[PDB]
Design a protein around this ligand. Structure first.
Ligand SMILES: O=C(NCc1nc(C2CC2)cs1)c1cc[nH]n1
Ligand SMILES: [Zn+2]
Ligand SMILES: [Zn+2]
Ligand SMILES: [Zn+2]
Length: 420
C-alpha cells in the first residue's frame, strides 16, 4: 500500500474535528506521531488473516480487542497498559502468525493511541531466534518475536487496516448486523473490536472467496489431512461392504475422486463448492437409492441414507479462527469459512462409531473394534495390530481437529465380520 494513497477522513472527524479531507497515509502516519507502510492492502490483510486483531478505543480511554479484553488507560497509566498489550498479543498470536494486523473501524482515538504502545523502524529479527521481531523492550533495548517477548513493553512494526476505507454506508453496528446475529453491542470497546473483525471476515471470506491463496503450515495440517483421507476411505469402504448399496451419490467438491476406487458400486458425482455463508438447503441440492456421501458438504438436513463428515465450528485450535454469525474460518492450506455447526442437521442419522476394518493379508492387541480375520479367529496379528493403532491415532487426530462423523442409522459393524 503506497503511503501516497489517499485516506478517507470523514470517519475520523468527530474525534478529530477539522481533519483535512485531503489526506495520504504518509500524512496520517505523521499525525499519529510516527516496513514501507503501517497500513496494508486488503490483499495483504487476507494473506495474514491469522494475524487479525480487532481493535477499538472509546473515549480516560477504554481499549477493546477482539480477544474480549478491555483495558482502561488513564484505569492504569500507559506504561503498564502497554505491558499488558504485549503479553496479550504474544499469547494470542504466537502459534498463529509472525505479525499482528490491527483491524479498525477508525473514528480517531484508536489511531492516536498507537504512539503510546507502538514503536516502528526497520524490519528486525528476534534476539533469541530467527523469527521476525514483533515487540521491543525499552529496558534492554532488544527485540523479540511473539514467543520470546516476556517482559517486553512495546509492540513493534504492527500492521493495520481501516475497514471504513472499503466503502460502507452507515455505522459499524448497522453493517455488521446485516450479516451476523451472534455479536451483540454491549457498549464496550471489545464489542466494537469483535464486530469490526467479524465484518472484515465476512467481506473477505464469506461475500468473497479466494481459494488460490495459500497459508503457511503452523500445526498438524498435514497429519490432519492424511487422517481425513484415511478415515474417508475406511468408512466408505466399510459402508459399501456392509450394506451393499448399488449406487453412491458423492455430493461436494467438483474435483472429488472416488475414495474407494475398487468398490463395485455405481459412483455418481454431484458438484457443490464449499458453502461459505449458509448451509446448503437439501431441497435445492437434490438420491433415495443407495447411499449419499457428504464429505464436508454442509447441508441444513442430511437425508437418512447418508454418510457425513461435518466440521464442528466450535472446536478450539490454532487452525480454526472465530468467524461470522457463528461460523468459523478454518485455515488449513486454504481458508474455508464454515457455517455454524448445527446438531439438528443430523436428526436423521447417528454418530459413526469408531472401528477398524481390514481385509488385507495377515503388547498384543485386544479389541472388539479391530474387525479383521485374525481377530475373528481369536488373536490379532502384529500387522493388523500395528495398523489398528495407526488408524486409531489418525481417527483421534481428525476428531480433535474438529471433524464429526455421522451415518445412516442401520449401519452395523457386526455385518462386516461375514466379509471374512
Ligand atoms: O461506551 C463505551 N465504552 C465505555 C467507556 N469507558 C471509558 C473510560 C474508563 C472511563 C471510555 S468509553 C463503548 C461505546 C462503543 N463501544 N464501547
Ligand atoms: Zn524469538
Ligand atoms: Zn459478528
Ligand atoms: Zn491380521
Amino acid at each position: 500500500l503506497s503511503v501516497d494513497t489517499k485516506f478517507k477522513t470523514e470517519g475520523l472527524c468527530v474525534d478529530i474535528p477539522g481533519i483535512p479531507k485531503d489526506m495520504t497515509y504518509r500524512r496520517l502516519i505523521s499525525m499519529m506521531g510516527f516496513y514501507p507502510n503501517m497500513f496494508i492492502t486488503r490483499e495483504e490483510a487476507i494473506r495474514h488473516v491469522r494475524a487479525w486483531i480487532g481493535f477499538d478505543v472509546e473515549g480516560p480511554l477504554q481499549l477493546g480487542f477482539s480477544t474480549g479484553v478491555n483495558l482502561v488507560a488513564v484505569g492504569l497509566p500507559w506504561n503498564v497498559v502497554r505491558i499488558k498489550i504485549v503479553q496479550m498479543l504474544s499469547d494470542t498470536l504466537k502459534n498463529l502468525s509472525d505479525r499482528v494486523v490491527f483491524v479498525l473501524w477508525a473514528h480517531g482515538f484508536e489511531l492516536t493511541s498507537m504512539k503510546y504502545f507502538v514503536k516502528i523502524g526497520p524490519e528486525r529479527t528476534c534476539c533469541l531466534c530467527d523469527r521476525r521481531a514483533t515487540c521491543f523492550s525499552t529496558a534492554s533495548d532488544t527485540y523479540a518475536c511473539w514467543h520470546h517477548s516476556i517482559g517486553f513493553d512495546y509492540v513493534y512494526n504492527p500492521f493495520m487496516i481501516d475497514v471504513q476505507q472499503w466503502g460502507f454506508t452507515g455505522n459499524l453496528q448497522s453493517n455488521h448486523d446485516l450479516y451476523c446475529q451472534v455479536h451483540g453491542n454491549a457498549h464496550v470497546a471489545s464489542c466494537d473490536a469483535i464486530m469490526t473483525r467479524c465484518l472484515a471476515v465476512h467481506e473477505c471470506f464469506v461475500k468473497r472467496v479466494d481459494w488460490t491463496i495459500e497459508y503457511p503450515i503452523i500445526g498438524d495440517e498435514l497429519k490432519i489431512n492424511a487422517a481425513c483421507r484415511k478415515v474417508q476411505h475406511m468408512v466408505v469402504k466399510a459402508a459399501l461392504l456392509a450394506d451393499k448399496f448399488p449406487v453412491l451419490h458423492d455430493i461436494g467438491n467438483p474435483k472429488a475422486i472416488k475414495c474407494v476406487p475398487q468398490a463395485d458400486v455405481e459412483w455418481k458425482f454431484y458438484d457443490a463448492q464449499p458453502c461459505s455463508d449458509k448451509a446448503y438447503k437439501i431441497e435445492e441440492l437434490f438420491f433415495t437409492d443407495g447411499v449419499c456421501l457428504f464429505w464436508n458438504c454442509n447441508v441444513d438436513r442430511y437425508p437418512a441414507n447418508s454418510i457425513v463428515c461435518r466440521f464442528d465450528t466450535r472446536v478450539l485450535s490454532n487452525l480454526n479462527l472465530p468467524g461470522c454469525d457463528g461460523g468459523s474460518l478454518y485455515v488449513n492450506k486454504h481458508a474455508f469459512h464454515t457455517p455454524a455447526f448445527d446438531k439438528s442437521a443430523f436428526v436423521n442419522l447417528k454418530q459413526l462409531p469408531f472401528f477398524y476394518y481390514s481385509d488385507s493379508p495377515c503388547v498384543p492387541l485386544k479389541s472388539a473394534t479391530c474387525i479383521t480375520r485374525c481377530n475373528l479367529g481369536g488373536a490379532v496379528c502384529r500387522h493388523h495390530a500395528n495398523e489398528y493403532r495407526l488408524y486409531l491415532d489418525a481417527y483421534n487426530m481428525m476428531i480433535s481437529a474438529g471433524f464429526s462423523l455421522w451415518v445412516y442409522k442401520q449401519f452395523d459393524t457386526y455385518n462386516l465380520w461375514n466379509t471374512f
